[PDB]
Write an enzyme that holds these catalytic residues in place. Structure first.
Site, PDB file in Angstrom:
ATOM      1  N   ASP A  97       0.828  -1.188   0.000  1.00 21.46           N
ATOM      2  CA  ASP A  97       0.000   0.000   0.000  1.00 21.46           C
ATOM      3  C   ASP A  97       0.871   1.250   0.000  1.00 21.46           C
ATOM      4  OD1 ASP A  97      -1.771  -2.069   0.415  1.00 21.46           O
ATOM      5  OD2 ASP A  97      -3.028  -0.934   1.817  1.00 21.46           O
ATOM      6  N   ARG A 155       0.282   6.181   0.164  1.00 23.14           N
ATOM      7  CA  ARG A 155      -0.269   4.948   0.709  1.00 23.14           C
ATOM      8  C   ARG A 155      -1.635   4.633   0.105  1.00 23.14           C
ATOM      9  NH1 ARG A 155      -1.628   4.032   5.573  1.00 23.14           N
ATOM     10  NH2 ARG A 155      -3.452   4.914   6.650  1.00 23.14           N
ATOM     11  N   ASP A 198      -6.362  -2.292   2.721  1.00 22.05           N
ATOM     12  CA  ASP A 198      -5.747  -3.186   3.695  1.00 22.05           C
ATOM     13  C   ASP A 198      -4.497  -3.844   3.123  1.00 22.05           C
ATOM     14  OD1 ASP A 198      -5.740  -4.810   6.223  1.00 22.05           O
ATOM     15  OD2 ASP A 198      -7.845  -4.177   6.248  1.00 22.05           O
ATOM     16  N   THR A 199      -3.426  -3.841   3.908  1.00 21.61           N
ATOM     17  CA  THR A 199      -2.166  -4.437   3.485  1.00 21.61           C
ATOM     18  C   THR A 199      -1.937  -5.775   4.185  1.00 21.61           C
ATOM     19  OG1 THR A 199      -1.483  -2.208   4.168  1.00 21.61           O
ATOM     20  CG2 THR A 199      -0.074  -3.290   2.609  1.00 21.61           C
ATOM     21  N   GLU A 230       0.250  -6.796   5.853  1.00 25.06           N
ATOM     22  CA  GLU A 230       0.812  -6.586   7.182  1.00 25.06           C
ATOM     23  C   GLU A 230       1.859  -7.646   7.505  1.00 25.06           C
ATOM     24  OE1 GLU A 230      -3.166  -5.686   8.606  1.00 25.06           O
ATOM     25  OE2 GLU A 230      -2.263  -4.904  10.451  1.00 25.06           O
ATOM     26  N   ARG A 280       2.130  10.682   5.555  1.00 23.06           N
ATOM     27  CA  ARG A 280       2.008   9.774   4.421  1.00 23.06           C
ATOM     28  C   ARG A 280       1.009  10.309   3.399  1.00 23.06           C
ATOM     29  NH1 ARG A 280       6.716   7.389   5.011  1.00 23.06           N
ATOM     30  NH2 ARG A 280       6.857   9.658   5.321  1.00 23.06           N
TER      31      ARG A 280
END
EC number: 3.1.31.1
Length: 140
Positions: free
Chosen positions: A21, A35, A40-41, A43, A87
């Site tokens: 992202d 970003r 949703d990334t 993670e 960001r």
């Protein structure tokens, strides 16, 4: 039949890819960290050959579109537009298509954490998210 030049967006180029992202874009002749807004990334970090089916594909895809796209476009929100880290709170487009919607519509990512005054593409991602969710496209 008089004027059809509503709205207005600004283009940009990928200075350098960060992860998924997160990506560096060219803003004001300078490199800024953008970003995948309301996206949703995985993670993740760097799991072995196994564990977690998602990750590289999600991060690679986002970079795939921007890199493959001769031109990138970003659209900042209407609220903050920049978090603590400053960001880039905008959607990254590729060849004329918002990459964010791609991951969201494909399955690599999902719509999470979003609300007024942030809702530039809420109605757009709202469907792309729930649409792929009900069918559990890929990674769902």
């Amino acid at each position: 039949a008089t004027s059809t030049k509503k709205l207005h967006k600004e283009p940009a180029t990928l200075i350098k890819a960060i992860d998924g992202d997160t990506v560096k874009l060219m803003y004001k002749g300078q490199p800024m960290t953008f970003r995948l807004l309301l996206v949703d990334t995985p993670e993740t970090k760097h799991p072995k050959k196994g564990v977690e089916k998602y990750g590289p594909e999600a991060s690679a895809f986002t970079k795939k579109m921007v890199e493959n796209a001769k031109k990138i476009e970003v659209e900042f929100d209407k609220g903050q537009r920049t978090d603590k880290y400053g960001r880039g709170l905008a959607y990254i487009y590729a060849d004329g298509k918002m990459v964010n919607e791609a991951l969201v519509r494909q399955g690599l990512a999902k719509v999470a954490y979003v609300y007024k005054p942030n809702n530039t593409h809420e109605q757009l991602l709202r469907k792309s998210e729930a649409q792929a969710k009900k069918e559990k496209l890929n990674i769902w």
